[PDB]
Amino acid sequence: SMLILTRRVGETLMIGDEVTVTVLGVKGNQVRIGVNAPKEVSVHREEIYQRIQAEK
Amino acid sequence: GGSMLILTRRVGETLMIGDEVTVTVLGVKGNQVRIGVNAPKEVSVHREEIYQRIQAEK
Amino acid sequence: PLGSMLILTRRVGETLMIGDEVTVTVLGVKGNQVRIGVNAP
Amino acid sequence: PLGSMLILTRRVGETLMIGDEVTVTVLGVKGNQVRIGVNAP
Amino acid sequence: MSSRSELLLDRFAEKIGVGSISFNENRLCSFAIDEIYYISLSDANDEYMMIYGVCGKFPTDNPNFALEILNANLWFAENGGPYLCYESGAQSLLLALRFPLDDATPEKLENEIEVVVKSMENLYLVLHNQGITLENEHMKIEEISSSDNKHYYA
Amino acid sequence: MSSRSELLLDRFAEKIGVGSISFNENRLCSFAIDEIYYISLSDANDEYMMIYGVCGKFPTDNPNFALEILNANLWFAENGGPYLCYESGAQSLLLALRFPLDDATPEKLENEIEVVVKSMENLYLVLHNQGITLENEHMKIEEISSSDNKHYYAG
């Protein structure tokens, strides 16, 4: 279930009860993204996480 | 005549200054010499040009 | 100024992992508007 | 395998300081032999 | 006129959009990248410029943290990235990167500052994943604390 | 041999006369320059080689020491390497410096290693003047304790 939505710079979306994602800015096709999440909730660049796990 | 005592030492030989400092010629390669120094922990050892620039920071 | 907020950069097509089962993908960008894809647990 | 010995390289014409009163200068080199200039009280 | 680093800095300021950035008594200036990242520039030598990405106040209580930062310098060395450093005057954690002034261009200066910013992003992510958030104080490097040993560190 | 990095290592072991040197299981080979300085080489990737100068065992008591080492990285950054680092496996202080494999000759590799050696000497010197001598334990790096965060440590 992939939820597709739209936000503008300065706007926010909630994921669950403890995580909020903020659209901080746009430069070209790059989006600055803010994340509020607890300590135990890890944040990863997905391509970096996949390279980590590809090495066993 | 810049140095008071001039002498020669071969690789593996030793020169003593006083009785608490020992200078060892460890190796020679080209015009650079590996030098070993045994000295008390409070006696400081410096490359003279680096010490001069430590003085340059007035 | 933003407190403990973690700030990342994501280009169109790049994905962000949150936790073990949440992913956020930048699906498109124009102006100050971006489209986001959130995979739900 | 040199223990607590302090080791440093000196080119011909470079000087080594020991304490405040002693200097050791590499004056010349031939083969495995070195000419050393020493200043000490 | 100006040194070719001061002229480069004014030209980079106009290209990025910050009003007027100038070096100070200690040949240091500080500014904000996208109003998020504190970058300081040092006009130390006429052959190189220093880029400092101030990450945050160094954890006063964590002895393992310094060792983890040193251990991360391994992989920063592999990737040719900036150096993880500690500024003792402000007790800040820094990312330091040398920028050569020969063939220097505002485009290259921006791209190297971007490398510093990207490294800051990835470090902030790693620190967050370890449950660490660095305090945000003394982010503008007014002055670097000097040491006698700095001339030997080469 | 299967890379220009292996051919570089073989020609370098010939030029120095350290005998037969070969990258091990983890592509880490350790040797001694002048039978004095412990240096390890890692075939990091197909584009770069890593030169590690193992200074000694990291002090266990002084926490301020880690702060001094970190502060020293400021000035090592001004002078173009090497990097003062900590290796978690052997608990050792070391100087790391990458070597480009483009146009790489054993003379260049030897000169870069000499830059590591000069830095090791300077570090030994400043530690002695501070009153510190590093214990000489676990000098040969056969394996590097890897961190999952290594892929994030880049710009």
Author numbering:
A (entry chain H): 0 to 55
B (entry chain F): -2 to 55
C (entry chain G), D (entry chain E): -3 to 37
E (entry chain A): 1 to 154
F (entry chain C): 1 to 155
Question: Which passages does the manuscript contain on this structure?
Answer:
secreted protein Tir (translocated intimin receptor). It was later shown that CesT also interacts with a variety of bacterial effectors (e.g., Map, NleA, NleG, NleH, NleH2, EspF, EspG, EspH, and EspZ) and is therefore better characterized as a multicargo T3SS chaperone. A central player in this system is the CsrA/RsmA protein which is able to bind the ribosome-binding site (RBS) of target messenger RNAs (mRNAs) and thereby repress translation initiation. The CesT protein is a newly identified CsrA ligand in E. coli. With an extensively overlapped site involved in binding to both CesT and RNA, we further show that CesT modulates the CsrA activity via competitively antagonizing its binding to mRNAs.
The result enabled us to make a new CsrA construct that reserves only a single CesT binding site by linking CsrA-Cdel with full-length CsrA via a ten-residue linker (GGGGSGGGGS). Inspired by the high homogeneity of the CesT/Re-CsrA complex, we used this protein species for crystal screening and managed to collect a dataset of 2.3-Å resolution. The final model contains, in the crystallographic asymmetric unit, two CesT/Re-CsrA complexes which are essentially of the same structure. As expected, each complex is composed of two Re-CsrA molecules and one CesT dimer. In the complex structure of Re-CsrA bound to CesT, however, the chaperone molecule adopted a quite different dimeric fold (denoted dimer form B hereafter). The N-terminal α1-loop–β1 module, instead of being swapped into the other protomer, remains unswapped and pairs with strand β2 of its own molecule. A most important stabilizing contact was contributed by the α4 helix, which protrudes into the otherwise exposed groove formed by helices α2 and α3 in the other protomer and presents several residues (especially Y153) for mainly apolar inter-molecule interactions. Overall, Re-CsrA utilizes its intact CsrA-dimer part composed of helix α1, strands β1′, β4, β5, and their intervening loops for CesT engagement, contacting mainly the β1–β2 interloop, the long α3 helix, and the swapped terminal helix α4 (from the other protomer) in the chaperone dimer. A series of charged and hydrophilic residues were observed to locate in this second patch, forming a strong polar (hydrogen bond and/or salt bridge) contact network. These include the Re-CsrA residues R31 located in strand β4, K38 in the β4–β5 inter-loop, and V42 (with its main-chain groups) and R44 in strand β5 interacting with the CesT amino acids D34 in the β1–β2 intervening loop, Y37 in the β2 strand, and E121, N122, N129, T133 in the α3 helix and its following loop. Superimposition of the two structures on the Re-CsrA/RsmE proteins revealed an extensively overlapped region between the RNA binding site in RsmE and the CesT binding site in CsrA.
